[PDB]
Design a protein around this ligand. Structure first.
Ligand SMILES: COc1ccccc1NC(=O)N1CCCc2ccccc21
Ligand SMILES: COc1ccccc1NC(=O)N1CCCc2ccccc21
Lengths: 240, 255, 235, 247
């Protein structure tokens, strides 16, 4: 029995918002790889369709749905639709001067969705909520301001919610990417990329998959005592 | 008085692929659990203790659980003990590329040498031991261009307990982050795990029920729940995580 | 007198009692013209009375920081009759509470920034909430509010720095006020046990920090949250 | 007798590392506020310069030779101050041991520094304990280089200092001794002055205030921390960095 525990997710339903591209897509595939039934979502019908195509292409059971996390109606309706056709999602991954509005809107959406999925986790007496922070999204001071503020909001939010729902054996954690190989870093020249790399002790951009593996671990039974945590996944580049 | 006690299925969990792992403080509790989890994942595990009987218990446990490796005597406060043990491991087993520092300078170690007992002396001596051992294992990780160093914080024990616990945690976070920066370019990750209140032979002493009230999950953590995190940090999937301190405390945060 | 605020106009919200009152008096003591605010006309009148009683020039006003109209109107009133306030002190379901609070900081801060921008000088100082609430809910709400305030203050500081406007915060621990003075003896005794100084802080001890942050000597301090808690750190 | 907000009349203050820059500024600010100031250096010429400056600015006190790495130097200097001046109840630790800098240097520097804080702090606590009043104030090191090594070393030093200051504050609180820290960012020094026009202008871009801090701006904070008005502040690290936060 030493070599035999689940670190797998057979029998679980997972909702991953923002799953059509990059980090979200990678998360969807990693959870599927681990045996979950995955519902990935996008804000558009073509994005939802791409998700279903990808899942099937990689042999993952589940679906692609349209979801707008800013809308109570969209949230309520989508969950009803998942409950009827697939079951309650017990693993939920929120991937979906301006800094204030962005961060405030983001955190209101986490709260809206998190609240909505908690009834079913409460009823199962088990759950995993995992919040994905935003990747370093611009090179100057505005980028650092926005990135740091978003991270701080996410850390405080995640910690509070973890406290609120702990007695129900629901964990609530966050993953805080640094510079990841996605479309903002892809659009810098070789010289600027290598200069950014000089701030990163590992000397390379992170892969989407490297975010997904952490999320996969946080979703497992082995991470059951981890809650209210924000795991930084940034190759050693710390910016706050 | 022997100080070196060594010890057809293919398990899907064996991702640590014959890698050699050194886990200090492995005779008991969290350390023992870490040794077993790394073995479960297919590493060759060298667990250490400060005594020959502890080293023997480690070898006995490893064999009992089907893990290849050994139990050794190691004093992390001593340059000689460190140098010698590593040379011994290199000759007989290979270079350890996964290193887990769980062995902490006790209060009672300093006290026998007649240096002071205060938070300062404890934390300073502890962090000097992490540095000593970490430096020693870095030559072989540098040469392999791969490595994992993972530092285990101390479990929660009045105000003196809170002072010492909080100072130790802050030292560990700053230390781990700095060392991660220093060795990053070599694809060596350096991380920490910060336990909260964990079920060990020390805990079970009304106070229990009060303590649990500070823990959102309403229960003590299991040694195994620490070990799983350490195991993940050691994996290829945690390759972009470095300089991090993962708290494993059921939601109880004490600064 | 490097601590002089002679010639400056200061707006201190929530000034009719406790920490807010103490802040209003400390800034006046340092020579500012102080406009203190409350949510009611009788509160505004108490503020004017107190100021006069302590020899401080300024006024008491009614202000609801949850309302764009109240904010706009009050600033217009102050600008006409007193001048632009260049020192602003914000003293006035965890989710809804913290979110609403931080929306109010933003609303007011934005509003006063036009005049600080035009003067190319400013001080914004945000006061966190005091410890003295029951159980886990009290700790949850307190910790979330503190983290929001730290992140908010740091971001805003970054946004407005180039204009020589500093933005800082003060994070009180267990302070002697009308809200804590009659907490049950068991919670009070527990709180004291967690405090290395072994005493509750005074309102004045918060006010002195705010006063220093408002001075020219604190000009290179920005985006900081100064904890004022006798050594009790709660996260 | 007298009673004022920022007055340090009647207090004796020990400021280590006082012969130049931030330390010198701190010594003068405390003197300005009425303290008797003992400033220290590691050399006789540095001690001389301190006495000369104090007298030039009308501050009572002295300049002493002190090696904070040495128990004997620490013991002896405190004896000397106790005999001739009185017990120092305000103590400001600015004295840190400063192809010259890589990212591996952090350990030895920070370890040596924090051992010296502890040594000195312990030594001055007997007199503060007996007076049932005290101020210990630790000064962090200024951002000391432009690359990753500079950030590594600076961040490590800041973290050590935060943890240290907070723990010591907890240990000595019941005695009405406060223990705080000041964490400078980029301050106007010979390290910022050496660097070319392009590097200077780039550096300032990381600082929201768009300028280097002055030594005096650090000294004003220290002065406030030393006052009776800061009596409920303890275990705090006040960052003084114009909005540039690196950890
Ligand atoms: C928070 O650090 C401490 C608090 C109380 C006692 C000792 C320490 N720190 C300490 O001994 N080291 C070891 C020396 C370099 C260092 C660098 C970053 C963090 C910790 C440390
Ligand atoms: C940690 O902060 C929170 C905890 C619980 C709910 C909301 C928040 N944060 C929050 O409302 N804002 C306001 C929105 C911009 C923001 C930026 C940095 C830190 C906090 C916040």
């Amino acid at each position: 029995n030493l070599y035999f525990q689940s670190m797998s997710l057979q029998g679980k339903v997972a909702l991953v918002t923002g799953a059509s591209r990059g980090i979200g897509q990678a998360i969807a595939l990693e959870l599927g790889r681990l045996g979950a039934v995955v519902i990935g979502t996008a804000t558009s019908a073509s994005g939802a369709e791409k998700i279903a195509e990808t899942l099937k292409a990689n042999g993952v059971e589940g679906a692609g749905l349209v979801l707008d996390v800013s809308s109570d109606e969209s949230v309520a309706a989508t969950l009803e639709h998942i409950q009827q056709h697939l079951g309650q999602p017990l693993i939920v991954v929120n991937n979906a001067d301006e800094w204030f509005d962005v961060v405030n809107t983001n955190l209101n959406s986490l709260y809206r969705l998190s609240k909505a999925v908690l009834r079913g986790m409460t009823k199962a007496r088990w759950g995993r909520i995992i919040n994905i922070g935003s990747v370093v999204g611009a090179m100057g001071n505005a980028g650092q301001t926005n990135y740091a503020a978003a991270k701080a909001g996410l850390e405080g939010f995640t910690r509070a919610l973890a406290r609120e729902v702990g007695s129900r054996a629901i964990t609530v954690n966050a993953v805080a990417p640094g510079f990841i190989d996605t479309d903002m870093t892809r659009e810098l020249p070789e010289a600027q990329r290598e200069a950014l790399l000089g701030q990163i002790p590992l000397g390379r951009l992170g892969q989407a998959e490297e975010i997904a593996k952490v999320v996969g671990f946080l979703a497992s039974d082995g991470a059951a005592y981890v809650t209210g945590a924000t795991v930084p996944v940034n190759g050693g580049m710390y910016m706050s």
